[PDB]
Amino acid sequence: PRVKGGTVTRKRRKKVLKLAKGYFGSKHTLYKVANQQVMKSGNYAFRDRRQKKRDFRKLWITRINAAARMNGLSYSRLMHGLKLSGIEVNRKMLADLAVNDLTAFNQLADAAKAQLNK
Amino acid sequence: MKLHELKPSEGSRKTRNRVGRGIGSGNGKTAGKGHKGQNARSGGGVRPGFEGGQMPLFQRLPKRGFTNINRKEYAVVNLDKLNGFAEGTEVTPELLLETGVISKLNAGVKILGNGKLEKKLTVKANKFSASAKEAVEAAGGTAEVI
Amino acid sequence: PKMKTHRGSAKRFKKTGSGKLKRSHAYTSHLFANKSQKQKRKLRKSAVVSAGDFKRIKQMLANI
Amino acid sequence: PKVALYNQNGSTAGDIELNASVFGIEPNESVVFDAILMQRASLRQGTHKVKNRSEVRGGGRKPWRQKGTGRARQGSIRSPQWRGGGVVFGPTPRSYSYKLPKKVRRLAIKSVLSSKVIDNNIIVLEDLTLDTAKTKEMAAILKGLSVEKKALIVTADANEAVALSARNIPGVTVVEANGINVLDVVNHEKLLITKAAVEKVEEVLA
RNA sequence: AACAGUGGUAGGAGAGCGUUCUAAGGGCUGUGAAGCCAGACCGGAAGGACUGGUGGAGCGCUUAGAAGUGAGAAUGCCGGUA
RNA sequence: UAUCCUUGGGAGUCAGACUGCGAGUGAUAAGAUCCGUAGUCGAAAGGGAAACAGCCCAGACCGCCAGCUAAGGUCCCAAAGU
RNA sequence: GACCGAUAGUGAACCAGUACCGUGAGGGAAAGGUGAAAAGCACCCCGGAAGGGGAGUGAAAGAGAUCCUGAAACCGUGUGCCUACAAGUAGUCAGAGCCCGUUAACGGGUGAUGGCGUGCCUUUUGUAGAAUGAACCGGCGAGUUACGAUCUCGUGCAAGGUUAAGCAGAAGAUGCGGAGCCGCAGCGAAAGCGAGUCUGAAUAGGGCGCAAGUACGUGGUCGUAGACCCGAAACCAGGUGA
RNA sequence: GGAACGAGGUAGAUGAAGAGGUCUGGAAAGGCCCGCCAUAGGAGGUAACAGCCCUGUAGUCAAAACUUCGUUCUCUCCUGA
Ligand SMILES: [K+]
Ligand SMILES: [K+]
Ligand SMILES: [K+]
Ligand SMILES: [K+]
Ligand SMILES: [K+]
Ligand SMILES: [K+]
Ligand SMILES: [K+]
Ligand SMILES: [K+]
Ligand SMILES: [K+]
Ligand SMILES: [K+]
Ligand SMILES: [K+]
Ligand SMILES: [K+]
Ligand SMILES: [K+]
Ligand SMILES: [Mg+2]
Ligand SMILES: [Mg+2]
Ligand SMILES: [Mg+2]
Ligand SMILES: [Mg+2]
Ligand SMILES: [Mg+2]
Ligand SMILES: [Mg+2]
Ligand SMILES: [Mg+2]
Ligand SMILES: [Mg+2]
Ligand SMILES: [Mg+2]
Ligand SMILES: [Mg+2]
Ligand SMILES: [Mg+2]
Ligand SMILES: [Mg+2]
Ligand SMILES: [Mg+2]
Ligand SMILES: [Mg+2]
Ligand SMILES: [Mg+2]
Ligand SMILES: [Mg+2]
Ligand SMILES: [Mg+2]
Ligand SMILES: [Mg+2]
Ligand SMILES: [Mg+2]
Ligand SMILES: [Mg+2]
Ligand SMILES: [Mg+2]
Ligand SMILES: [Mg+2]
Ligand SMILES: [Mg+2]
Ligand SMILES: [Mg+2]
Ligand SMILES: [Mg+2]
Ligand SMILES: [Mg+2]
Ligand SMILES: [Mg+2]
Ligand SMILES: [Mg+2]
Ligand SMILES: [Mg+2]
Ligand SMILES: [Mg+2]
Ligand SMILES: [Mg+2]
Ligand SMILES: [Mg+2]
Ligand SMILES: [Mg+2]
Ligand SMILES: [Mg+2]
Ligand SMILES: [Mg+2]
Ligand SMILES: [Mg+2]
Ligand SMILES: [Mg+2]
Ligand SMILES: [Mg+2]
Ligand SMILES: [Mg+2]
Ligand SMILES: [Mg+2]
Ligand SMILES: [Mg+2]
Ligand SMILES: [Mg+2]
Ligand SMILES: [Mg+2]
Ligand SMILES: [Mg+2]
Ligand SMILES: [Mg+2]
Ligand SMILES: [Mg+2]
C-alpha cells in the first residue's frame, strides 16, 4: 500500500515555527531558517544555563566587595576572615545582606575583622 | 488464542533496519556505508574472492585430482543402527529403506563396525567391513553378501 | 536464481569433516632444481585454507 | 475430554468423550500464531505493481545537454525525481504464501480445537438434519443452542440443507470435517460439530 | 538498595515514536468525522492529548500483520510566490 | 586492577594534522618532507593563551540565583591583592 | 485485490496521443469536486461594463460557476509593546518599564539595557569560511523485491528432518503426493577401505577424521539480477532529413 | 452433407420482508424501543451509514433468429490372420 506524505510533515514543521515566534523577519516565518535558529537557541540555552551560575556569582562577589570596602576590608580578606570564623553564609546570602540588611552584613564583616586582627 | 490478542513467540520476530532515514537512527545519510570509494556505490564492491589484482588464492594453488565416472557411494549402516531390530529379523536393504534406517540406497548398503551389536540377525547387505562381518557373526548372526 | 559455484575453486579445494578447506601447495609445478628436498617434501603434502582467506572465499564453495 | 452431547432442539442426550490426543492437548500458542499468520498470508492476492523508469511511457532522450545550460544534469524526463517519473522499487506482483511443516499444521489445528474445549465453546450435536433448507429454522436451532455470536458449524459430509440455511446468517460458516482450518476455528466463538464429524476429525488428526 | 558509569565522526548493537493499509475485538461520529487554524497542556526524545474556531462525513483505540513508512539540502522534478 | 583469549555475525578505515622529544632529506630553511616516540585535534564542548582544530588546564547524562579548585589571574575595561 | 486515489494511478479520470514543439522520423503536456435538488440569485440600488451592496433561494451563498476543504510562501489593513548616538549569524541568558490575563502555571506579549555568541549542509588534516549546495514555500524524491547462500534468534520434530511438481479444494487453509533434498562417517586424486583412512617398505611418524540435525519463519549480511537514487562523454542497431 | 434431441452464448422474466414507532435533523439509511424476511445480509442507488425504499441479489424461468458444444441417427468409408 502507498503511504502519502500526508499531515505529519506540516505538523512537525509548524511546531518548529511556533518555537520561533518573536524571531526577526524570516526567522519566525520560514521553516528552514526557523529550524536553524531554534537549534542554535538550544545550544545557547544549554551554554547560558551554565553561564548564569557564573554571572550571578560574579555579581554577588562585586556587591560583597563594595560592602566590605565600606567596612574597611577588601573582598579577599573578608572571605578569609569569614572562613577563619567558620561562617558558612554563601555569596548569594552575603550579597543579599549587603543590599537589604547592611547592618547584619557589617556584623559578619566585624566577625571577619576579629579573626584577621588575631 | 484470539485474533484480537495475537502475540509472537519471544525472539521470533525482529523489526527490520531501515537505513537512510535520518541521523537519530545511526544509519542516516551514508546508510552505514561510510564515505566514498567503490564499496559505498550502488551496485558497488568487487566480485567474491577478488583481491584487488593480487593473484587470487584459488588461482595461486594447483588443481588436484579427477572425478571417477563410475564412483560408488554406499548407504552406510553402523552396528548401533542394527540394534533397533529384534532377534531373528532378516535385515535386507528393502527393510532398512522401508523402516527408514537409510534414507536412500545409492550403490547399496554397507555395514560398518562402529558401536555394539547384541542381536542375532541375518544381515543381508551389499558390502561389509571386516569388523562388521566379525561383529554380526560374533553375536550369532549371518552376514550375507547380496 | 541459484548461486553458482566458483568452478576454479571447486577444482582446487575440498571440505574436511569439521568444515575446513583442504588445499594443495603452490610452487609444485616446475623449477624443482631451485627448491631443496626439504621444501619439496613439505610442498608435496596438503594444507588448510587460512582463516583470513576462508572468510573471503567460503561462500564461493557453499554448494559443495 | 468429556463434553455434553446435545440435539438440534438443545436438550442434552448424554455426554460424548472426545479423543484426548485431538481435543485434550495443551495448546501451543506459538504454533497457533504461526498458523494464523501463514493462513492470512496465503489469502493475499498480491496483485500490486508500479512502473519503474523503464516501464513509464516515453523518457528516451536526454532532456537537455550535460553541460552549459545551468540546469541540473538529467538523463530522462521519467527519472524518479521527476513528476510523472518511474517509481523506485515499490510493489511488484508476488505471493505471500509459505508452508509450515505438516506436524506443525497438525499441532495448530489440535491446539485450537483443544482450546475450544477449555473455553467451553464446543457444542457436539447428535445430528444436524434440517428437513427444509430454511434460514428461519437454522436461526431457531442456533437460538435453541444459545449461539448468540459467531459459530462454525462442522458436518461430516457436505450437507446441502444446512449449508444453504446457514449461508445468509452473518457470522455463521458451514464446513465439512475435511474443511476445518485454524483461522475459521479461531475466528468463530462457538464450534458446532456433529458426532459423525468428530469421528471423521479424529480419524485424520489422531 | 548500594556501588560505578553515561563527550563522540565512521561504524556496530539496543529500545522506541509516527505514517498508510489489513485482521480481530471494542468504540467514536450530523447532539458534528477527517482535514485545517489557534492556545499559557502532557511525555526522556521521536511525539501525544484537551479546549475553542473552521469543516461538513467519515475516523480513532487495542493487539497482531504488511509496507510506495518519515526530507532541509541531490546547480533534484513540478507548482506557486517572492 | 579487570582485563585477556577463542569461535562466529556486522562493520568502518587505507588523504591525516599540529605540538614536544629522537633522526633522515633540506640550507641542522619552511605552517616543508619522511620515519620513530608521546600527546592533543580528528571524533572533544568547558576555562586560559585578545581572536586562534592541533599549545596550557580539563573530558559536557540533565537541573540549581550553592561550595572548593586547575591553568591562568587579582589598577580600570574584567571576577579577585592598587 | 492488507493495488492507486488527481504531482498518485495509464502519457491520457477532463473531447489526449489532443494542444504545443519539430522539415521529418519523432517528442509530448496541463486540466477532476456548486448543491440533495438549479431551487443557477425575480426585484431594488451604485456602475458604460466588470464588480459589488441589499433582497430572494438553500441546511449552508464566507456553497454564486477552474463554485467541497482551503495549509505555507507571498501581499495587505488595523494596533498592544518597542524603535531616529546606533556597529547587529539576529539568538540566548540576565532584566526593568509598559500592556495583558491562561489548558493556572514559581503565567502571556513586548523588550530600554548588560553578558555570551562567526547560519545549515556537504567535503575536509583543518571550513564562519573569501570551498560546495539551497530565492522562498508546498508536494514528489534514494538499501527494494525475487530466487539462492550463510549466520543469529524462534518454533516443530529429532538420528533423523522434510516433501517438489501434481491431484482434490474459496485464487484459501488442508488432505494426498517420498520422486527428490539435507543430516546420521570419514579418509583418499582415485581404485577403494571404513572409526578410521591417506602418505609410506613400515605395528613408525605425520595429515584429515573418530573418540544434532532438519523443515519453516523473523532479522543481519552476501550472490545473481539496474540491486540505494540521480548524472556522462561515448558505442551499436533500425529509421528520418539536401 | 443432413436431421433430431440436450446443454450453453448473444435480449430478457419472475423474485421474500418495515414509509414500525419515536428522537435529533435540511433530509434518517443514524440513535433508542419494537417487528419481519432470508436458497435473497452480493452490489449500486436513494437528501447522513438500508437484508425489508428503488434497481437488484439467492432461487427459478425464458429465445423468433444467429451461434458454440455434445449426443444419437443418418451419411460416408472399409478383410486381416
Ligand atoms: K555498515
Ligand atoms: K475539528
Ligand atoms: K522508499
Ligand atoms: K531543493
Ligand atoms: K611527531
Ligand atoms: K501526466
Ligand atoms: K503588524
Ligand atoms: K543580547
Ligand atoms: K569556487
Ligand atoms: K593416523
Ligand atoms: K531446531
Ligand atoms: K536470511
Ligand atoms: K542489494
Ligand atoms: Mg490509499
Ligand atoms: Mg514528502
Ligand atoms: Mg562553576
Ligand atoms: Mg554513527
Ligand atoms: Mg543530512
Ligand atoms: Mg557523500
Ligand atoms: Mg577517501
Ligand atoms: Mg569505504
Ligand atoms: Mg608435476
Ligand atoms: Mg526507456
Ligand atoms: Mg507514475
Ligand atoms: Mg558514550
Ligand atoms: Mg562525561
Ligand atoms: Mg544497526
Ligand atoms: Mg485517512
Ligand atoms: Mg477538536
Ligand atoms: Mg518514501
Ligand atoms: Mg604519518
Ligand atoms: Mg606538515
Ligand atoms: Mg618502537
Ligand atoms: Mg574525517
Ligand atoms: Mg581521545
Ligand atoms: Mg579552548
Ligand atoms: Mg575566549
Ligand atoms: Mg569544526
Ligand atoms: Mg576560593
Ligand atoms: Mg574587579
Ligand atoms: Mg487534491
Ligand atoms: Mg496523471
Ligand atoms: Mg507543424
Ligand atoms: Mg466557510
Ligand atoms: Mg459534500
Ligand atoms: Mg473552495
Ligand atoms: Mg535613542
Ligand atoms: Mg557619542
Ligand atoms: Mg585542502
Ligand atoms: Mg561572505
Ligand atoms: Mg566540489
Ligand atoms: Mg547557490
Ligand atoms: Mg524544496
Ligand atoms: Mg565503431
Ligand atoms: Mg531521403
Ligand atoms: Mg528535395
Ligand atoms: Mg422485480
Ligand atoms: Mg418510520
Ligand atoms: Mg452530508
Tab-separated table of N, CA and C in Angstrom, chain A residues 40-111:
chain	number	residue	atom	x	y	z
A	40	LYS	N	20.011	26.512	17.195
A	40	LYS	CA	21.023	27.401	17.749
A	40	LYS	C	20.615	27.854	19.153
A	41	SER	N	19.332	28.206	19.324
A	41	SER	CA	18.766	28.592	20.608
A	41	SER	C	18.978	27.516	21.672
A	42	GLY	N	18.883	26.236	21.279
A	42	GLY	CA	19.150	25.114	22.162
A	42	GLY	C	20.588	25.110	22.677
A	43	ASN	N	21.564	25.178	21.758
A	43	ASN	CA	22.972	25.278	22.116
A	43	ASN	C	23.214	26.463	23.050
A	44	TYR	N	22.638	27.627	22.729
A	44	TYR	CA	22.834	28.826	23.529
A	44	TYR	C	22.197	28.679	24.908
A	45	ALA	N	20.964	28.162	24.967
A	45	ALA	CA	20.262	27.986	26.230
A	45	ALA	C	21.023	27.038	27.153
A	46	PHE	N	21.563	25.942	26.602
A	46	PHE	CA	22.345	25.000	27.383
A	46	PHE	C	23.583	25.691	27.955
A	47	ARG	N	24.346	26.363	27.083
A	47	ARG	CA	25.529	27.119	27.471
A	47	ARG	C	25.200	28.156	28.548
A	48	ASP	N	24.073	28.862	28.393
A	48	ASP	CA	23.772	30.015	29.222
A	48	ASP	C	23.194	29.617	30.574
A	49	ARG	N	22.532	28.456	30.670
A	49	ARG	CA	22.170	27.896	31.965
A	49	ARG	C	23.423	27.661	32.809
A	50	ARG	N	24.539	27.260	32.177
A	50	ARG	CA	25.824	27.156	32.855
A	50	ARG	C	26.394	28.543	33.164
A	51	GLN	N	26.379	29.469	32.191
A	51	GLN	CA	26.948	30.802	32.374
A	51	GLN	C	26.179	31.622	33.413
A	52	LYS	N	24.867	31.386	33.547
A	52	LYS	CA	24.022	32.031	34.547
A	52	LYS	C	24.609	31.872	35.953
A	53	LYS	N	25.108	30.674	36.282
A	53	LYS	CA	25.671	30.382	37.595
A	53	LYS	C	26.989	31.128	37.809
A	54	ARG	N	27.766	31.302	36.733
A	54	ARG	CA	28.978	32.105	36.755
A	54	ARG	C	28.642	33.587	36.944
A	55	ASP	N	27.638	34.089	36.207
A	55	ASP	CA	27.326	35.512	36.154
A	55	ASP	C	26.748	36.019	37.474
A	56	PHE	N	25.912	35.211	38.142
A	56	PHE	CA	25.337	35.596	39.425
A	56	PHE	C	26.401	35.592	40.521
A	57	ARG	N	27.296	34.593	40.522
A	57	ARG	CA	28.390	34.548	41.483
A	57	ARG	C	29.279	35.779	41.324
A	58	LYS	N	29.600	36.132	40.073
A	58	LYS	CA	30.329	37.348	39.739
A	58	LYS	C	29.627	38.593	40.283
A	59	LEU	N	28.297	38.658	40.153
A	59	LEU	CA	27.516	39.789	40.637
A	59	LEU	C	27.566	39.874	42.161
A	60	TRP	N	27.385	38.745	42.862
A	60	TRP	CA	27.403	38.736	44.321
A	60	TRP	C	28.760	39.166	44.865
A	61	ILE	N	29.844	38.663	44.267
A	61	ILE	CA	31.192	38.997	44.700
A	61	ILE	C	31.415	40.505	44.582
A	62	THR	N	31.017	41.104	43.447
A	62	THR	CA	31.135	42.542	43.221
A	62	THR	C	30.431	43.330	44.325
A	63	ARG	N	29.236	42.886	44.729
A	63	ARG	CA	28.445	43.569	45.744
A	63	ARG	C	29.029	43.387	47.142
A	64	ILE	N	29.537	42.183	47.443
A	64	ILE	CA	30.209	41.914	48.706
A	64	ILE	C	31.467	42.778	48.808
A	65	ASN	N	32.199	42.922	47.697
A	65	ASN	CA	33.428	43.703	47.670
A	65	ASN	C	33.122	45.165	47.993
A	66	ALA	N	32.037	45.699	47.410
A	66	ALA	CA	31.598	47.068	47.647
A	66	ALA	C	31.237	47.290	49.116
A	67	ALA	N	30.462	46.362	49.696
A	67	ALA	CA	30.040	46.448	51.087
A	67	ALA	C	31.221	46.261	52.040
A	68	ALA	N	32.102	45.294	51.741
A	68	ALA	CA	33.309	45.059	52.522
A	68	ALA	C	34.148	46.332	52.634
A	69	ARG	N	34.345	47.031	51.506
A	69	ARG	CA	35.189	48.217	51.440
A	69	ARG	C	34.576	49.415	52.166
A	70	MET	N	33.244	49.444	52.328
A	70	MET	CA	32.583	50.384	53.224
A	70	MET	C	32.925	50.099	54.693
A	71	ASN	N	33.208	48.828	55.040
A	71	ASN	CA	33.674	48.417	56.364
A	71	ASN	C	35.203	48.334	56.473
A	72	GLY	N	35.952	48.865	55.494
A	72	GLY	CA	37.407	48.881	55.543
A	72	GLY	C	38.051	47.500	55.377
A	73	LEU	N	37.455	46.640	54.535
A	73	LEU	CA	38.026	45.356	54.144
A	73	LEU	C	37.879	45.199	52.636
A	74	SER	N	38.838	44.514	52.008
A	74	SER	CA	38.661	44.024	50.652
A	74	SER	C	37.845	42.735	50.710
A	75	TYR	N	37.302	42.310	49.562
A	75	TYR	CA	36.580	41.048	49.469
A	75	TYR	C	37.478	39.889	49.907
A	76	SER	N	38.726	39.859	49.414
A	76	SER	CA	39.676	38.788	49.694
A	76	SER	C	39.831	38.520	51.189
A	77	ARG	N	39.993	39.594	51.974
A	77	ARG	CA	40.246	39.486	53.403
A	77	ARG	C	38.960	39.129	54.143
A	78	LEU	N	37.823	39.711	53.725
A	78	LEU	CA	36.524	39.393	54.300
A	78	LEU	C	36.271	37.888	54.233
A	79	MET	N	36.438	37.290	53.042
A	79	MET	CA	36.137	35.881	52.847
A	79	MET	C	37.109	34.998	53.624
A	80	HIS	N	38.388	35.395	53.678
A	80	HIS	CA	39.362	34.731	54.530
A	80	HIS	C	38.910	34.769	55.991
A	81	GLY	N	38.520	35.958	56.471
A	81	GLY	CA	38.083	36.155	57.845
A	81	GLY	C	36.817	35.371	58.187
A	82	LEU	N	35.854	35.317	57.253
A	82	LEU	CA	34.636	34.535	57.427
A	82	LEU	C	34.954	33.038	57.494
A	83	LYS	N	35.915	32.581	56.678
A	83	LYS	CA	36.350	31.190	56.666
A	83	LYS	C	37.033	30.818	57.985
A	84	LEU	N	37.883	31.712	58.517
A	84	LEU	CA	38.544	31.502	59.801
A	84	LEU	C	37.533	31.481	60.949
A	85	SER	N	36.522	32.364	60.904
A	85	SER	CA	35.463	32.395	61.907
A	85	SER	C	34.521	31.192	61.797
A	86	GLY	N	34.534	30.488	60.654
A	86	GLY	CA	33.703	29.316	60.434
A	86	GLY	C	32.290	29.689	59.988
A	87	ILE	N	32.100	30.939	59.529
A	87	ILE	CA	30.841	31.404	58.972
A	87	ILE	C	30.754	30.849	57.550
A	88	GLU	N	29.648	30.150	57.253
A	88	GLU	CA	29.475	29.407	56.013
A	88	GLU	C	28.369	30.030	55.157
A	89	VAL	N	28.005	31.293	55.441
A	89	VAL	CA	26.996	32.028	54.692
A	89	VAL	C	27.566	32.290	53.297
A	90	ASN	N	26.805	31.936	52.251
A	90	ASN	CA	27.332	31.897	50.894
A	90	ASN	C	27.276	33.306	50.299
A	91	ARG	N	27.753	33.449	49.057
A	91	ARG	CA	27.903	34.755	48.433
A	91	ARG	C	26.543	35.344	48.065
A	92	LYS	N	25.601	34.501	47.623
A	92	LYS	CA	24.236	34.937	47.365
A	92	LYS	C	23.657	35.621	48.602
A	93	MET	N	23.798	34.971	49.763
A	93	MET	CA	23.243	35.463	51.014
A	93	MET	C	24.003	36.696	51.502
A	94	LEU	N	25.342	36.685	51.422
A	94	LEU	CA	26.146	37.842	51.796
A	94	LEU	C	25.788	39.059	50.942
A	95	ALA	N	25.635	38.865	49.624
A	95	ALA	CA	25.242	39.941	48.723
A	95	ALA	C	23.811	40.401	48.996
A	96	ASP	N	22.931	39.472	49.407
A	96	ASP	CA	21.571	39.804	49.810
A	96	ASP	C	21.591	40.745	51.017
A	97	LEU	N	22.401	40.424	52.039
A	97	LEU	CA	22.558	41.277	53.213
A	97	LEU	C	23.172	42.620	52.819
A	98	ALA	N	24.218	42.608	51.976
A	98	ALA	CA	24.879	43.824	51.515
A	98	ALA	C	23.882	44.845	50.956
A	99	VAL	N	22.873	44.373	50.208
A	99	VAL	CA	21.825	45.227	49.667
A	99	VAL	C	20.750	45.480	50.726
A	100	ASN	N	20.162	44.409	51.281
A	100	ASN	CA	18.901	44.507	52.007
A	100	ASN	C	19.108	44.870	53.478
A	101	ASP	N	20.062	44.217	54.166
A	101	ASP	CA	20.312	44.443	55.587
A	101	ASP	C	21.807	44.653	55.825
A	102	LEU	N	22.281	45.880	55.567
A	102	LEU	CA	23.703	46.195	55.604
A	102	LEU	C	24.251	46.148	57.033
A	103	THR	N	23.409	46.403	58.049
A	103	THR	CA	23.824	46.321	59.446
A	103	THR	C	24.174	44.879	59.821
A	104	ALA	N	23.358	43.913	59.370
A	104	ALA	CA	23.654	42.493	59.528
A	104	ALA	C	24.946	42.102	58.805
A	105	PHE	N	25.137	42.608	57.576
A	105	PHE	CA	26.363	42.390	56.820
A	105	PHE	C	27.572	42.902	57.605
A	106	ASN	N	27.444	44.093	58.212
A	106	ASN	CA	28.528	44.723	58.954
A	106	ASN	C	28.940	43.888	60.170
A	107	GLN	N	27.985	43.214	60.837
A	107	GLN	CA	28.297	42.315	61.944
A	107	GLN	C	29.169	41.147	61.485
A	108	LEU	N	28.822	40.549	60.337
A	108	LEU	CA	29.612	39.481	59.740
A	108	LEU	C	30.996	39.999	59.340
A	109	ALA	N	31.059	41.225	58.798
A	109	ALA	CA	32.322	41.875	58.476
A	109	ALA	C	33.154	42.144	59.733
A	110	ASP	N	32.499	42.519	60.846
A	110	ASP	CA	33.171	42.713	62.126
A	110	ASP	C	33.711	41.389	62.671
A	111	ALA	N	32.935	40.303	62.530
A	111	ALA	CA	33.373	38.966	62.912
A	111	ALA	C	34.616	38.539	62.127
